[PDB]
Amino acid sequence: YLPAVFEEVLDLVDAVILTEKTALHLRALQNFRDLRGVLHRTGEEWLVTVQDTEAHVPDVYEEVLGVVPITTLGPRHYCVILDPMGPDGKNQLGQKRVVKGEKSFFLQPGERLERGIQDVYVLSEQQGLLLKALQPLEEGESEEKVSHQAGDCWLIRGPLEYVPSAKVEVVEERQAIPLDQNEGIYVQDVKTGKVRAVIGSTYMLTQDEVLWEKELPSGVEELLNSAPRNKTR
Amino acid sequence: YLPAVFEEVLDLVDAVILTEKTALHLRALQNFRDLRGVLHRTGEEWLVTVQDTEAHVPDVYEEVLGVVPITTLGPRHYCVILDPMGPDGKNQLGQKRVVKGEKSFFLQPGERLERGIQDVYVLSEQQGLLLKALQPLEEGESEEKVSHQAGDCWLIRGPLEYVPSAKVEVVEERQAIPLDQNEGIYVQDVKTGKVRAVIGSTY
C-alpha cells in the first residue's frame, strides 16, 4: 500500500486467528458497522467466532478486550453461568443458568461461571442427595413432577445422575447404612420428633430423619460381655 | 473544529460510556434542555442510562455527580430502598420500599439501600420467623390476609420463603424442637401466663 500525502501510517495490525476452540471478545469504541454488517453501539461488547470469520482484524472501531477459550462441558459435567445473556441480547443480572449435556459454548460478554466446570452428580443405590428448595416452584424441574415449596428439604435417591437446578441446593450426601435382621438404627423424625428405631434391611435417612442417641443407665458394661459403643444404631 | 476569533477553547470533554451495568448520575447546574429534550431545573439530579444514550457527553449545563453501578437483586434477594422516588419525580423522604424478585435497577438520585442486598428469608418445616407488626394494617401484605395490629407479634412458619415488608420487622428465628412420645417442653403462654407442658410430637 502506497500512503497518500495525508495518511500518517500507523502500526500494521495483524488478524487474530480464530479456531473453534477460541473466540475473540471485543468492545466497540464507538458506533459503526462491522465487516459482516452488524450494528454496534458505543460500548457494546460481543464475540466473534469461526462462524463469522476465521481470521479477524481488530478494527479501528473495536478494542479487543481479549480472547476467550471455549468452555466445554463433557458428557458428564455442568456449569452455572452467572448473568446469562437472554434473547434480548443483554446480561440477565443476578440470575443464573445451569448448562449441561456434552456442550461446548463461549462465555458471552458479562457471563461468568459460578464455580466453573465442577462435576455432574452420580449416585448409586446406596447414595442419596439431601437437597433444599430454597427457591419455590420446582414443578417441571425433573421427572418427579412433585412441586417442592420454598425451603422444604427432600432426599433424592436411586441409581441415577443429577444436576442441581438454580433453585435447588445440595445440602448433604446421605450415604446409606447396611443393616441385616436383628440390627437397625435409631431414627428420630425431626418433622414430628417421633423415634422409630428402624431395623431390618439396609436403610438411609429420609429428608427429616436424624440418628438419635440412646443413653443407657450405666447398664452397658454388663451387656457388652475398650471400644465405645455406637450408641446411635 | 476551527475556533472563532472569540471562542476561548477549553479542555476537550470525553463522553462517558454507559453499559447496561452502569448509569450516569448528574445534577443540572442551571435551567436548560438536554439533548433528548427534557426540561431540567437548577439543581435537579437525575440519571442517564443506555435507554437514552450509549455514550453521554457531560454537558456544559450538567455536573456529573458520579456513575452508579446497577443494583441487581437475584432471584433470591431483596433490598429496602430508603427515600424511594414516587411517580411525581421526588424522593419520598422517611419512607422505604422493599424490592425483590430477580430485578436489576438503578439507585435513583436521593435513594439509598437500607442495609444493601442482604438475603431473602427461606424457612423449612422446622424453622419459623417471629415477627412484630410495629406498623399497623398488614391486611393485603401476603396470602394470609390476616390484619395484624400495631405491634402484635406473630410467628410465620412453613416450608416457604419470606420478604419482610417495610411495616413488619423480624424479631427472632424460632427453631423448632424435636420431641417424641413421653417427652416435651414446658411452654408458658405469656399472653395468659398459663403453663401447658406440651409433650408428644415435635413442637
Curated annotation (Swiss-Prot), chain A:
Q: Where are the MVP repeats?
A: 15-69, 70-120, 121-176, 177-233
Q: Which GO terms describe its molecular function?
A: identical protein binding; protein kinase binding; protein phosphatase binding
Location (main, coarse)? cytoplasm
The superkingdom of the source organism is Eukaryota
Q: Which UniProt keywords apply?
A: Acetylation, Cytoplasm, Isopeptide bond, Nucleus, Phosphoprotein, Repeat, Ribonucleoprotein, Ubl conjugation
Modified after translation how?
A: Phosphorylated on Tyr residues after EGF stimulation. Dephosphorylated by PTPN11.
Does the record carry Ribonucleoprotein as a key word?
A: yes
| Phosphoserine: residues carrying this PTM | 218
Q: Which GO terms describe its cellular component?
A: cytoplasm; cytoskeleton; nucleus; perinuclear region of cytoplasm; ribonucleoprotein complex
> Mind listing the GO biological process terms from this record?
cell population proliferation; ERBB signaling pathway; negative regulation of epidermal growth factor receptor signaling pathway; protein activation cascade
- On whether Cytoplasm is a keyword of this UniProt record, the answer is yes
**Record's subcellular location:** Cytoplasm; Nucleus
Subunit-structure text = The vault ribonucleoprotein particle is a huge (400 A x 670 A) cage structure of 12.9 MDa. It consists of a dimer of half-vaults, with each half-vault comprising 39 identical major vault protein (MVP) chains, PARP4 and one or more vault RNAs (vRNAs). Interacts with TEP1. Interacts with PTEN and activated MAPK1. The phosphorylated protein interacts with the SH2 domains of PTPN11 and SRC. Interacts with APEX1. May interact with ZNF540.
Per the entry's comment, what about the domains? Answer: MVP 3 mediates interaction with PTEN.
User: What is the role of this chain?
Assistant: Required for normal vault structure. Vaults are multi-subunit structures that may act as scaffolds for proteins involved in signal transduction. Vaults may also play a role in nucleo-cytoplasmic transport. Down-regulates IFNG-mediated STAT1 signaling and subsequent activation of JAK. Down-regulates SRC activity and signaling through MAP kinases.
Descriptive protein name: Major vault protein
Q: What species is this protein from?
A: Rattus norvegicus
Q: Which gene encodes it?
A: Mvp
